């Protein structure tokens with residue numbers, strides 16, 4: 318299983334390199350594998366790394382190419398005019414540019430398999446596309462191929478798609494190497510994966526990463542395990558967690574912190590074509606947006622997430638209703654029975670379902686898992702599975718029964734179609750999680766619930782106080798517990814925005830002094846300050862020197878434990894761009910002890926300004942390195958939906974940042 322061609326140390330400086338004499342006559346049979354280790358830290362807008370072409374006049378559309386874009390997209394073209402074949406396969410956000418200042422060696426493996434009629438592309442150990450066709454075109458079998466080229470494609474005698482970069486190593490094989498053999502090829506990745514396609518979650522997609530360093534030194538991560546592509550609810554989403562006991566070097570197989578069972582956990586390849594990419598799992602309950610904190614006193618870890626029932630709806634479901642009924646100073650979860658046109662039930666004390674019209678209790682109770690019991694017996698519903706077998710999304714019963722939950726479409730009793738917040742705890746630092754409990758309404762019976770700010774909660778250094786930031790229209794709403802999360806109270810902090818996705822994260826600058834950085838609609842990150850451990854909040858200011866888009870992106874933030882240039886330091890993680898979710902940065906700010914103002918002194922580029930960077934999580938690791946888990950793609954863009962293995966983890970040292 319040896320190369321028919323092997324070469325390296327090619328410099329692509331806007332001048333193609335001819336390797337036709339070396340390669341062309343070696344090509345034989347209809348299956349080929351290309352292995353290429355390359356750097357491109359200053360790419361042109363659109364460039365080919367490798368071309369096989371008919372360079373003759375009139376045959377400009379007869380070539381094979383491996384190309385990239387300065388957005389980080391990778392692809393191939395496979396074209397033959399006489400055969401009437403014009404294949405283009407690609408995936409956005411497939412590349413690295415730079416890491417710690419140095420050009421990243423990307424490892425690219427392209428397999429053209431005539432027997433399976435399939436083209437498969439791997440970059441950096443990640444499969445980014447695998448495409449089967451009815452009419453297979455061997456790359457070697459393009460009519461009149463007479464040029465093998467590095468760093469351009471020769472069409473009619475001219476250099477198209479000129480590249481800037483380098484190819485440190487390239488090998489070709491007259492065989493389609495197995496997925497197994499692919500996995501044995503050495504990689505030089507700057508990142509690692511915590512959560513990934515095919516792991517225990519069986520989600521093909523992940524979003525909304527979090528990171529938190531526990532007092533034992535265990536580092537914990539939570540994430541949205543997203544099943545129906547990368548869409549926000551409506552979809553099927555569970556909250557998964559993983560932890561590292563060796564400063565981020567390795568990570569446990571994920572488990573669920575919050576899960577529903579109404580729909581099967583399926584690993585699905587979500588269509589990316591314009592006609593089908595907006596298909597959505599539409600009848601599933603789900604979670605979305607998790608946040609983690611650790612309680613010094615009990616030692617427990619606490620995880621909150623938004624919860625959504627299957628009946629949720631983007632506009633008329635359900636602002637102006639909390640889903641609870643106030644009865645004598647207390648709040649009770651409302652319920653609608655199959656058949657009624659209003660919510661004539663509540664879940665009163667010990668989960669007894671009461672009929673509000675008659676105030677009489679019923680023979681139904683709700684257990685700890687929000688499951689329905691009749692006379693003490695567990696009611697069930699049939700699970701759903703999804704498929705695109707018929708050329709469109711279908712959601713159908715799969716024969717399997719699962720406990721009946723009030724969040725489900727098929728349930729006898731349903732909650733209000735609105736967003737809630739749930740809380741779970743772990744007593745073993747993320748080895749297992751309790752059944753979740755809904756938090757009560759904070760803004761009243763008739764206000765819909767606030768939205769959890771994903772990332773971290775705040776454990777104040779000097780007290781037992783726990784704080785989770787949430788948002789709603791017109792304010793941040795901080796949730797405050799002084800009793801290990803048994804009871805919560807709110808602290809409202811008005812902001813000058815209506816319907817902003819005001820995702821907020823907090824740092825403690827010094828004892829009792831909290832600064833909250835948050836997402837806005839102004840193109841600038843905002844902040845407010847509290848000096849009484851979250852009781853009251855200042856007016857809103859904005860950060861200069863960092864740009865976000867009009868719609869903005871989540872910002873992650875930590876207080877670094879060590880002095881930098883002799884001052885207290887805060888590190889922010891955000892895209893730095895007014896155009897899209899790209900140009901990732903860690904920004905180091907130094908605190909001015911005179912006024913608690915922050916001088917944003919150091920900007921570290923995570924990767925190229927044009928390479929994707931969206932939601933993020935940062936934590937100070939126990940060894941004082943910085944851990945970063947982040948969406949490495951544009952999670953807003955309608956062109957970069959449903960990509961696998963783009964949430965990645967890196968390790969950095971402060972010297973890297975400065």
Ligand SMILES: O=S(=O)(O)CCNCc1cccc(Br)c1
Nearest residue numbers: 549550551605606623768952953
């Ligand atoms: O669009 S993004 O800014 O990439 C992500 C925004 N998610 C906000 C949200 C929170 C809870 C439920 C639902 Br539904 C949406």
